[PDB]
Structure 1
Amino acid sequence: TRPANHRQLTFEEIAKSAKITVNEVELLVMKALSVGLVKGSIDEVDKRVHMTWVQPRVLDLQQIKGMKDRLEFWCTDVKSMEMLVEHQAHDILT
């Protein structure tokens, strides 16, 4: 669920999630990484976990509508940057 912008999960977040105090979220994340569910690292000095992957699974129609919305945004950004570059460099495009 967390987007790549702020995929820095926190020990307190994982505590408010599946019920465990913050002294074994470390072990839980270790188990996840070892099994291969997720990838990344755990900065326990700052008490947060960096996730750079997730094992994909099967989704719901609403979970795909969310992906559709995210695409809509991405397409809009790409089109805007395309128009900007094309207009700016119009006089040198071959």
Structure 2
Amino acid sequence: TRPANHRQLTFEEIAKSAKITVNEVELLVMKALSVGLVKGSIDEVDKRVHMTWVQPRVLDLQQIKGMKDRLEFWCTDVKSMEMLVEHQAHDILT
């Protein structure tokens, strides 16, 4: 739901919204270790539940449309900056 960083999440939304306590969040991921969709490297000096790779969703057709700000972003930005490299690496065409 938040795609961005702070993926080393504190347990606060975990202990709040997922109706769990502080002593069980480890079980909440160690059982999830037996699940294996997410394999976070959970901090234990700060109790921070870290986010690694996941099985994300099932369907967000509003983001099958609204994926343009990532897909076309990737397209014209890796392609445009591709042409910024090749526009810098221009007259070594030789």
TM > 0.5:
yes
Given that residues 39 and 53 in structure 1 are in contact (C-alpha distance below 8 angstroms), is that contact kept between their aligned partners in structure 2?
yes
Question: In the alignment, does 2:27 pair up with 1:41?
Answer: no
Q: Which runs of 5+ in 2 are unaligned?
A: none
Deviation at 1:76, TM superposition (A): 3.2
> What TM-score results when the alignment is normalised by the length of structure 2?
0.78
Q: Deviations over 1:11-67 (max 9, x none)?
A: 112123211222211110111122112112111212212222112542131242343
Do the aligned residues in 1 keep the contact of 2:8 with 2:42 (CA within 8 Å)? Answer: no
Which of structure 1's runs of 4+ aligned residues deviate more than 3 A?
A: none
> Greater CA deviation, 45-54 or 66-75?
66-75
Q: Distance in 1 between matches of 2:15 and 2:66?
A: 26
Q: State TM-score, norm by structure 1.
A: 0.78
C-alpha RMSD over aligned residues: 2.1
The structure whose residues are more often strand, as a share, is 1
What is the DSSP-based 3-state SS (H/G/I as helix, E as strand, rest coil) of the residue aligned with 2:65?
helix
Q: Quick check: 32-41 or 83-92, which moved more?
A: 32-41
**Whole-angstrom distance in 2 between the partners of 1:39 and 1:59:** 22
Count of residue pairs brought into register by the alignment: 94
- Which range moved further: 58-67 or 27-36? 58-67
Partner-residue secondary structure (3-state), 1:34: helix
In 2: Cα distance, 1:28 partner to 1:16 partner:
13
Distance, in Å, in 1 between the alignment partners of 2:48 and 2:7 is: 10
Q: Which moved more, 1:37-46 or 1:3-12?
A: 3-12
The residue aligned with 2:69 is 69
